[PDB]
Ligand binder design. Sequence first.
Ligand code: ZN
Ligand code: ZN
Lengths: 66, 148, 254, 115
Amino acid sequence: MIIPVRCFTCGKIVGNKWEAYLGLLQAEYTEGDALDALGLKRYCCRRMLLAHVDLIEKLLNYAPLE
Amino acid sequence: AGILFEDIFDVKDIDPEGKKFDRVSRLHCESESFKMDLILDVNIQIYPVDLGDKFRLVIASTLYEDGTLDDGEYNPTDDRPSRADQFEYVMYGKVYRIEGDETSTEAATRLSAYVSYGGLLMRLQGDANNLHGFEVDSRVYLLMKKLA
Amino acid sequence: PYANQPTVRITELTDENVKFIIENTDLAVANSIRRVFIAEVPIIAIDWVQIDANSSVLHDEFIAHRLGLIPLTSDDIVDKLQYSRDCTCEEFCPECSVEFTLDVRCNEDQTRHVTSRDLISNSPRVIPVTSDDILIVKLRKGQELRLRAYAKKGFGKEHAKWNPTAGVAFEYDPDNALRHTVYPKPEEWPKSEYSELDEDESQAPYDPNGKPERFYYNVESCGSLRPETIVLSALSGLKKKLSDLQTQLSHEIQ
Amino acid sequence: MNAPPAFESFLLFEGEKKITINKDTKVPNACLFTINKEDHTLGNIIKSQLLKDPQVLFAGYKVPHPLEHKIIIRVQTTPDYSPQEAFTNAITDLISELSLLEERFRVAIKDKQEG
Ligand SMILES: [Zn+2]
Ligand SMILES: [Zn+2]
C-alpha cells in the first residue's frame, strides 16, 4: 500500500528511502546499485525496497469523499 | 585393589568397516601378554588414537583403590585418591553379556565379555581364567593410558 | 567460584552502529547482553494516537500503527522519564510522556507528502530522528490528516516499536575451533570477517579444552539512541534486573 | 480476542510473588526457585554462573511453558553450603561482572572517541 516504516525482520528504518530509491532509479542506477547507495547491506532490508509495490499512488487517483 | 583385569594392548586396526561415526572409532587391539582380542569403541575426538599405538588397559570395579563401592552416582567433589588420576582415558559402563565356548558337558575355556559404556561397546575375548572377575549386570570402569 | 574479568575492545564506532569484542566471558552472559540489546533497552516511541480528522486513503489504525514505528530521539531524556503506568497523573504529564501534534491540510493540487518533518513535538529534546524524512502518508487535494499523539517510555519486550536495534550481529568462535557447528563440507563455507585462518584451511584444529569466549558484537541503532548509549543502558538495565531479583530473593529468605 | 496483553510478560499483578523457594524432598540440599515474569535472560545467565561455582552439584533451569512467564531453577549443592547462599552469591557475582563491564565499556568509549 505504502512503504513500511521499519524493516520487518531487523527493524531498520526503510520508510525514509522509497522516494530516494525511485530518484536513484530515475538516475539510471541498477537496483542493486541503488540499494547499495542507500546503505541496505542485509538482504532482509534490500528485499523490502526491491519488492515493494506502491499502491497509494494509484489510490490517490480517486477523488476524496471529503 | 578391585582391579578385575589389567594388560597392555596395541591397536591393530582403527576403524575396520569404514568410518560410521565421525567422533567414535571401533579400535581392534591385541594383547601381547594375555593374548586377549579387544574390540572397543573410543571417542577419538577428545582422545585421538592412531594405528600402531600402545596403551595400558585396566578394568576395575571401583576407582578409590580401597574396595569402597562407587555408588554409581556422579560426585564431582571427591576427595578420595582416585585411580583415574593414573590414566588418560576413563569410561564407565556395565557388562551385559559373558559368552563362551562352553558345552553342556564341559565349562568354557574361552570367554567373551561384552561391556556397554553408555553405548560405546567393548568386547574382550580370551581364556576363561582372566575373566572370572566379570559377572553380568555389574558396573565397571575402563581405564586406558597410552604407553610410549 | 566468582565472576570473570571481562575485557572490552571497541573495533568501530560510528553514529549508526558500534562494533566491539568481549573476551573472558561465558556464553550465557554475552547472549543475555545481546538479548537485552534487542528487548530490554527502554526508548520513547509514539503511543496513544488520538485522531481528530483523517480523510486520507489509509484508515485510522494504519496511520496510528505507522506513527508508532517512527523512532524518536531519546538519548538523554529516557533515563529520567518514568513509565506512564507508574506515574501519578492523568497518564500524560511531562514527567512520563512527550506530546506530538500533526495537522496537515493538502490544498495544492500536487500530492502532499506527510513525513516525519510534520510531527511537531512539545519537547525539543524528543524529535523524529530523521529531523530524508519518514513518509507517513500521501494526501490528495482536499484531504486532511489532523491528530495529536503521545510518546511513552517502553522497551522492546512489550512491543517492537520500542526496540532500539536495527539488527544486532553476534558471533563467537569464527574458525569453529570448538566444533559447536559441524560442517559436512567445511571447504564450501565462506570465512567470517573475524576469521584468522589462511586461504588453505576451512576450520581451526579442534580444541577439546576450549570454551566460548571473544564474542564479537555489532549493534546497529535504528536512530533513537546512540549505539554506545544502547550498550550502556543495556548493561545498566540487566544489572538493575539482577539487583531487584536479589532484593526479592533476600525478602523471601528472610 | 484471547490475545494476552503485551504488558503481562514482565509485570507482576497484585498478590504475585517475584520469586518463591521450595525445598526438593527427593534429594537433600536441593531447592527449586520459581521466578515469575522472567524468561531466558535471567535463567541462562544465572544457570551459567551457578555452574561456575565448585560447590554446586546441580544447576539447571526451565521455562515450563513459553506462553506462560515462569522460570523454575533447580539448584543442588554440597551438604555444607545452601542453595539459597549459592543463588545469592551467583547474583552478586553477575552484578559485579556487569558493573566491571560497564566501567570498561565506558573507558573503551572514551578512548575510541578521543582516538
Ligand atoms: Zn532488514
Ligand atoms: Zn505523568
